[PDB]
Amino acid sequence: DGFVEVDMPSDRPFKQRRSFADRCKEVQQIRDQHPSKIPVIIERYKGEKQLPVLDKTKFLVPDHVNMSELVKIIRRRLQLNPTQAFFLLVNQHSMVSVSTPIADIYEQEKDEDGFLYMVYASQETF
């Protein structure tokens, strides 16, 4: 009766994989090396199945760009058709115009650890 050791890649959100201390320390280091860049965590929405999971979830973007540039980055990384539509929600369930500067979104919506959390989902998911 040996243990059937099962092991598989964790699908848990970034907040559950990295501790609060590690996340705070990481933003602190990043903002000290790159004071004009925003640390953004972009993950797949919890109820999304139509869109795949991206290999990368941590993004370091210039603080002079708008939400639009962030959509362009994710869209290309997802390799979407023009027929494929998706939303980019700040924190959770929160939607802003793509013309909105990310620096404005950051200072208003950033988590306590310093990261700005976003999720992507299909428009049909909601």
Author numbering: -6 to 119
Q: What are the paper's exact sentences on this?
A:
The nonstructural small (NSs) protein is the primary virulence factor of RVFV that suppresses the host’s antiviral innate immune response. Interestingly, these searches identified four putative LIR motifs that are located between residues 4–7 (4FPVI7), 59–62 (59FYNV62), 238–241 (238WIPV241) and 261–264 (261FVEV264) in the NSs sequence. In humans, the six LC3-family proteins (LC3A, LC3B, LC3C, GABARAP, GABARAPL1 and GABARAPL2) are key autophagy factors that function by regulating growth of autophagic membranes, recognition of autophagic cargoes, and fusion of autophagic membranes with lysosomes. LC3 proteins carry out their various functions during autophagy in part due to their ability to interact with other autophagy factors that contain LIR motifs.
The ITC experiments demonstrated that the NSs4 bound with sub-micromolar affinity to all six of the human LC3-family proteins under the experimental conditions (20 mM Phosphate pH = 6.5 and 50 mM NaCl) with the exception of GABARAPL2 which bound with low micromolar affinity. However, crystals were obtained by fusing NSs4 to the N-terminus of either GABARAP or LC3A, a method commonly used to examine the structures of LIR motifs with LC3-family protein. In complex with NSs4, both LC3A and GABARAP adopt the canonical Atg8 fold, similar to what has been observed in previously reported structures of their free forms as well as in other structures of fusion proteins with LIR motifs. Likewise, NSs4 bound in a linear conformation to both LC3A and GABARARP in a similar manner to what has been observed for a typical LIR motif in complex with an LC3 protein. In both complexes, the predominant interactions at the binding interfaces involve the side chains of F261 and V264 of NSs4, which are the residues located in the first and fourth position of the core LIR motif. These residues insert into HP1 and HP2 on the surfaces of LC3A and GABARAP respectively, which is consistent with most other previously determined structures of LIR motifs in complex with LC3-family proteins. In complex with LC3A, the aromatic ring of F261 of NSs4 forms hydrophobic interactions with LC3A involving the side chains of F7 (6.3Å) I23 (4.2Å), P32 (4.2Å), I34 (5.3Å), L53 (4.1Å) and F108 (4.1Å) as well as anion-π and cation-π interaction with E19 (3.3Å) and K51 (4.2Å) in HP1. In addition to the interactions involving F261, the side chain of V264 of NSs4 forms hydrophobic contacts with the side chain of F52 (5.3Å), V54 (4.3Å), P55 (4.1Å), V58 (6.8Å), L63 (6.8Å) and I66 (3.9Å) in HP2 of LC3A whereas, the corresponding hydrophobic interactions in HP2 of GABARAP occur between the side chain of V264 of NSs4 and the side chains of Y49 (4Å), V51 (4.1Å), P52 (4Å), L55 (3.7Å), F60 (4.5Å) and L63 (3.4Å).
